[PDB]
């Protein structure tokens, strides 16, 4: 395919976010690279406006799936790779249990040689002392699976999932993630059966980062057909 | 993309309180430019820059107030104009430069180097 051929190798990731959290507003820069061959990201962010005034954790499924290991029998319901490079918009709604939510457009797009993830984030309705604005979760990440079917009424991918961020007390919350997917160009799209995406995700602080920051590495390679 | 070399001048000996002007002109094009410093016993650490889209700046808190970067994006060159000088601000300074926009400040994170100009407050 024409977008496949766009990942046979490693392409370097530029992420830019600018964000507005019950009125808190913010940015955040990160770069990297992706190497679909292994279904691997390796990207860091850093905070340009001071501190983040939410956890670092709950931002990882905001901050380019394009780069998933779809295996050698599946290629043909790989959506993600086959929008570019025209690339998608990238809707999504995450409702945190008992609190706010955020809203987000992304358009993920190449610039170049480089894959670029520009994001738009709106957060409303969260309580101060929540567990997000009061910055009580663990810097850590689990696995998890995406589940994607087709949305054949806009030539794109319905797609969701819910995230378990692990609390400071030991206590979990649950982040209900509803996404949309649907490419900007004309040209055509494959749009696949239902399957799902294994992912796994670590963070990690850079010790020369004097700037608020964190370091995501991620492995994500997509099954569930046979 | 490499084979980009930093040329830095200025610096040199200065009497406590005094100011002294550090710049630094690149072969090409260049993203984001910092300037690092060195302790003589210590290594390297960042203290200052300016992103390639020039919407971000950062200095660190030590010396917040009294050194201003600024860039030419044309002549692709860089300045740190340092007032009110301090003892603990003599060191060799070098100027950075990445081949990318994001204002990193981990040495780790930049792809060119200076060859260091030394700035000795100490009179």
């Known amino acids: 395919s024409k977008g496949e051929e766009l990942f046979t190798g490693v392409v370097p990731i530029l992420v830019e976010l600018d964000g507005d959290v019950n009125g808190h507003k913010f940015s955040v820069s990160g770069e990297g690279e992706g190497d679909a061959t292994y279904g691997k990201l390796t990207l860091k962010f850093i905070c340009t406006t001071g501190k983040l005034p939410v956890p670092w954790p709950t931002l990882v499924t905001t901050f380019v799936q394009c780069f998933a290991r779809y295996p050698d029998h599946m290629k043909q319901h790989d959506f993600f790779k086959s929008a570019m490079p025209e690339g998608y918009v990238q809707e999504r709604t995450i409702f945190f249990k008992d609190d706010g939510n955020y809203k987000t457009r992304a358009e993920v797009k190449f610039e170049g040689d480089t894959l670029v993830n520009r994001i738009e984030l709106k957060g409303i309705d969260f309580k101060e002392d929540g567990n997000i604005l009061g910055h009580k979760l663990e810097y850590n990440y689990n696995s998890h699976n995406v589940y994607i079917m087709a949305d054949k009424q806009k030539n794109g991918i319905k797609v969701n999932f819910k995230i378990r961020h692990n609390i400071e007390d030991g206590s979990v919350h649950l982040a209900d993630h509803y996404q949309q997917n649907t490419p900007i160009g004309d040209g055509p799209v494959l749009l696949p059966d239902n399957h799902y995406l294994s992912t796994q995700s670590a963070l990690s602080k850079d010790p020369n980062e004097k700037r608020d920051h964190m370091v995501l590495l991620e492995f994500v390679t997509a099954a569930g057909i046979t | 993309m490499a084979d980009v070399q930093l040329v830095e001048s200025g610096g040199g000996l200065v009497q406590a309180g005094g100011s002294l002007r550090l710049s630094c002109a690149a072969s090409?094009?260049?993203?984001?430019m910092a300037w690092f410093r060195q302790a003589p016993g210590k290594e390297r650490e960042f203290v200052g820059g300016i992103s390639g889209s020039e919407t971000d700046t950062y200095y660190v808190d030590s010396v917040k107030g009294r050194f201003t970067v600024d860039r030419d994006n044309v002549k692709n060159t860089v300045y740190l104009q340092m007032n009110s000088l301090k003892p603990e601000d003599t060191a060799v300074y070098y100027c950075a430069a990445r081949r990318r926009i994001t204002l990193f400040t981990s040495r780790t994170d930049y792809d060119f180097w200076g060859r260091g100009t030394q700035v000795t407050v100490g009179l």
């Open positions: 090409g094009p260049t993203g984001a």
